[PDB]
Design an enzyme around this catalytic site. Structure first.
Site, PDB file in Angstrom:
ATOM      1  N   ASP A   1       0.820  -1.218   0.000  1.00  0.00           N
ATOM      2  CA  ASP A   1       0.000   0.000   0.000  1.00  0.00           C
ATOM      3  C   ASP A   1       0.859   1.276   0.000  1.00  0.00           C
ATOM      4  O   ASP A   1       0.597   2.217   0.738  1.00  0.00           O
ATOM      5  CB  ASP A   1      -0.955  -0.014   1.199  1.00  0.00           C
TER       6      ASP A   1
ATOM      7  N   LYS B   1       1.941   4.709  -1.165  1.00  0.00           N
ATOM      8  CA  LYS B   1       1.188   5.812  -1.759  1.00  0.00           C
ATOM      9  C   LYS B   1       1.490   7.040  -0.922  1.00  0.00           C
ATOM     10  O   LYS B   1       1.921   6.922   0.228  1.00  0.00           O
ATOM     11  CB  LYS B   1      -0.322   5.520  -1.783  1.00  0.00           C
TER      12      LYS B   1
ATOM     13  N   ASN C   1       0.618   7.369   2.785  1.00  0.00           N
ATOM     14  CA  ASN C   1       1.347   6.518   3.722  1.00  0.00           C
ATOM     15  C   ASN C   1       2.828   6.858   3.795  1.00  0.00           C
ATOM     16  O   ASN C   1       3.620   6.120   4.391  1.00  0.00           O
ATOM     17  CB  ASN C   1       1.196   5.037   3.351  1.00  0.00           C
TER      18      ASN C   1
ATOM     19  N   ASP D   1       2.252   2.628   7.893  1.00  0.00           N
ATOM     20  CA  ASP D   1       1.106   1.768   7.630  1.00  0.00           C
ATOM     21  C   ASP D   1       1.489   0.396   7.101  1.00  0.00           C
ATOM     22  O   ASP D   1       1.459   0.138   5.902  1.00  0.00           O
ATOM     23  CB  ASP D   1       0.089   2.416   6.696  1.00  0.00           C
TER      24      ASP D   1
ATOM     25  N   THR E   1      -4.568   0.095  -2.532  1.00  0.00           N
ATOM     26  CA  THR E   1      -5.369   1.250  -2.910  1.00  0.00           C
ATOM     27  C   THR E   1      -5.411   1.260  -4.438  1.00  0.00           C
ATOM     28  O   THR E   1      -4.376   1.147  -5.080  1.00  0.00           O
ATOM     29  CB  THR E   1      -4.734   2.522  -2.329  1.00  0.00           C
TER      30      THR E   1
HETATM   31  N1  ATP Z   1       3.404   8.246  12.901  1.00  0.00           N
HETATM   32  C1  ATP Z   1       2.576   9.211  12.515  1.00  0.00           C
HETATM   33  N2  ATP Z   1       2.867  10.532  12.644  1.00  0.00           N
HETATM   34  C2  ATP Z   1       2.007  11.471  12.229  1.00  0.00           C
HETATM   35  N3  ATP Z   1       0.811  11.180  11.668  1.00  0.00           N
HETATM   36  C3  ATP Z   1       0.427   9.892  11.478  1.00  0.00           C
HETATM   37  C4  ATP Z   1       1.298   8.810  11.911  1.00  0.00           C
HETATM   38  N4  ATP Z   1       0.698   7.633  11.628  1.00  0.00           N
HETATM   39  C5  ATP Z   1      -0.482   7.957  11.044  1.00  0.00           C
HETATM   40  N5  ATP Z   1      -0.639   9.300  10.973  1.00  0.00           N
HETATM   41  C6  ATP Z   1      -1.800  10.030  10.412  1.00  0.00           C
HETATM   42  O1  ATP Z   1      -2.954   9.193  10.496  1.00  0.00           O
HETATM   43  C7  ATP Z   1      -3.336   8.736   9.190  1.00  0.00           C
HETATM   44  C8  ATP Z   1      -3.804   7.284   9.260  1.00  0.00           C
HETATM   45  O2  ATP Z   1      -2.710   6.465   9.657  1.00  0.00           O
HETATM   46  P1  ATP Z   1      -2.506   5.038   8.959  1.00  0.00           P
HETATM   47  O3  ATP Z   1      -2.312   5.455   7.526  1.00  0.00           O
HETATM   48  O4  ATP Z   1      -1.386   4.285   9.634  1.00  0.00           O
HETATM   49  O5  ATP Z   1      -3.955   4.415   9.336  1.00  0.00           O
HETATM   50  P2  ATP Z   1      -4.704   3.124   8.712  1.00  0.00           P
HETATM   51  O6  ATP Z   1      -5.830   2.792   9.669  1.00  0.00           O
HETATM   52  O7  ATP Z   1      -3.687   2.070   8.418  1.00  0.00           O
HETATM   53  O8  ATP Z   1      -5.368   3.767   7.384  1.00  0.00           O
HETATM   54  P3  ATP Z   1      -6.315   2.938   6.374  1.00  0.00           P
HETATM   55  O9  ATP Z   1      -7.294   2.228   7.282  1.00  0.00           O
HETATM   56  O10 ATP Z   1      -6.940   4.028   5.536  1.00  0.00           O
HETATM   57  O11 ATP Z   1      -5.386   2.017   5.632  1.00  0.00           O
HETATM   58  C9  ATP Z   1      -2.069   8.919   8.361  1.00  0.00           C
HETATM   59  O12 ATP Z   1      -2.305   9.007   6.946  1.00  0.00           O
HETATM   60  C10 ATP Z   1      -1.509  10.205   8.935  1.00  0.00           C
HETATM   61  O13 ATP Z   1      -2.280  11.308   8.461  1.00  0.00           O
HETATM   62 MN    MN Z   2      -3.671   0.618   6.853  1.00  0.00          MN
HETATM   63 NA    NA Z   3      -3.033   4.135   5.510  1.00  0.00          NA
END
Ligand code: ATP
Ligand code: MN
Ligand code: NA
Ligand code: 21O
Ligand code: CL
Ligand code: CL
Ligand code: CL
Ligand code: NA
Length: 284
Positions: free
Chosen positions: A137, A139, A142, A155, A171
């Site tokens: 994933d 992109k 991420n 992620d 995605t």
């Molecule tokens: N370590 C970090 N530092 C700052 N912001 C973060 C961090 N981790 C995540 N975020 C913010 O939160 C958002 C979601 O995090 P992540 O992409 O890990 O969630 P996810 O649940 O895996 O998303 P999805 O369910 O859409 O795949 C990120 O795109 C970013 O905006």
């Molecule tokens: Mn995810």
């Molecule tokens: Na994500």
């Protein structure tokens, strides 16, 4: 000689602040650890939601994959803990947020910025693939940015420790054709995503775009895209060597002898690879 092997945190050990972002199953919150004053991004999942949607394995997988990573261009997992209702990942805080935010606001990166951030991503993927892990994933959403504006890839819920992998994850805009036609992904699938990302940095949107996933898939499998005018010529050449239907013919893939030839591409001529994480990034 091996000795015996060498304290879980709790929600109350932190002061929580703003929501940094959200996903389908997660909320990421800025937190300060009271005992150390360190800031973390804490990714929080609701157990009830994880159980209902059959995601239990991907929680453990995310922890285990991240526990293996210690490279400058990856978000770090410092700790995990749970309570009765929630699962918590303590991550390094990437203060400057998503790369996507900057593409949206600026529209297009200049050649120096495109080259620099592409190089950092290449460096990160070389490390990840060297460990036998595929992201799946990759992109701009991420790829986060730390306080110094170096990338922090995050992620790992869709990551796979290996070739081929059979889950249909990712995605749509960045999905490789092999995942669509062979129903499997490999390290080279991340190089396809890389090509999509480079194109996006230069052109503003990724190359296969539509408001419906089905439409995007139909274009991916036929390599139905083209370049705008003024697309940097060396970046175009590189993109054309990454957006290749045959996954064994992509620059950087194992069958093409890996990252040396990719890093050698003329687009990266000016790049000093050895200390990228210590260099000052170009201003966006
Ligand atoms: N370590 C970090 N530092 C700052 N912001 C973060 C961090 N981790 C995540 N975020 C913010 O939160 C958002 C979601 O995090 P992540 O992409 O890990 O969630 P996810 O649940 O895996 O998303 P999805 O369910 O859409 O795949 C990120 O795109 C970013 O905006
Ligand atoms: Mn995810
Ligand atoms: Na994500
Ligand atoms: O893997 C675990 C517990 C596991 C954990 C993994 C990632 C993030 C936070 C904690 C947890 C453990 O004790 O193993 C820890 O590492 O502290 C887990 C996964 C799913 C569920 C539920 F089914 F409830 F959703 C529960 C625990
Ligand atoms: Cl909480
Ligand atoms: Cl805070
Ligand atoms: Cl879409
Ligand atoms: Na590397």
């Amino acid at each position: 000689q091996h000795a015996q092997p060498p304290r879980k945190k709790r929600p109350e050990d932190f002061k929580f602040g703003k929501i940094l972002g959200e996903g389908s199953f997660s909320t990421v919150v800025l937190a300060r650890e009271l005992a150390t004053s360190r800031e973390y991004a804490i990714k929080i999942l609701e157990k009830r939601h994880i159980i209902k949607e059959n995601k239990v394995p991907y929680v453990t997988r995310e922890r285990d994959v991240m526990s293996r990573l210690d490279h400058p261009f990856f978000v770090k997992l410092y700790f995990t803990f749970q309570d009765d209702e929630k699962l918590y990942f303590g991550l390094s805080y990437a203060k400057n947020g998503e790369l996507l935010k900057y593409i949206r606001k600026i529209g297009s990166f200049d050649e120096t910025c495109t080259r620099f951030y592409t190089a950092e991503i290449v460096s990160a993927l070389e490390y990840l693939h060297g460990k036998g892990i595929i992201h799946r994933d990759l992109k701009p959403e991420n790829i986060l940015l730390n306080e110094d504006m170096h990338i922090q890839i995050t992620d790992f819920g869709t990551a796979k420790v290996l070739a081929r992998a059979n889950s249909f994850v990712g995605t749509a805009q960045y999905v490789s054709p092999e995942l669509l036609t062979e129903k499997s992904a490999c390290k080279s699938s991340d190089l396809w995503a890389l090509g999509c990302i480079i194109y996006q940095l230069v052109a503003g949107l990724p190359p296969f775009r539509a408001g419906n996933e089905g439409l995007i898939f139909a274009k991916i499998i036929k390599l139905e895209y083209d370049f705008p005018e003024k697309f940097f010529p060396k970046a175009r050449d590189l993109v054309e060597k990454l957006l290749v239907l045959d996954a064994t013919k992509r620059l950087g893939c194992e069958e093409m002898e890996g990252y040396g030839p990719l890093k050698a591409h003329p687009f990266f001529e000016s790049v000093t690879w050895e200390n990228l994480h210590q260099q000052t990034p170009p201003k966006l």
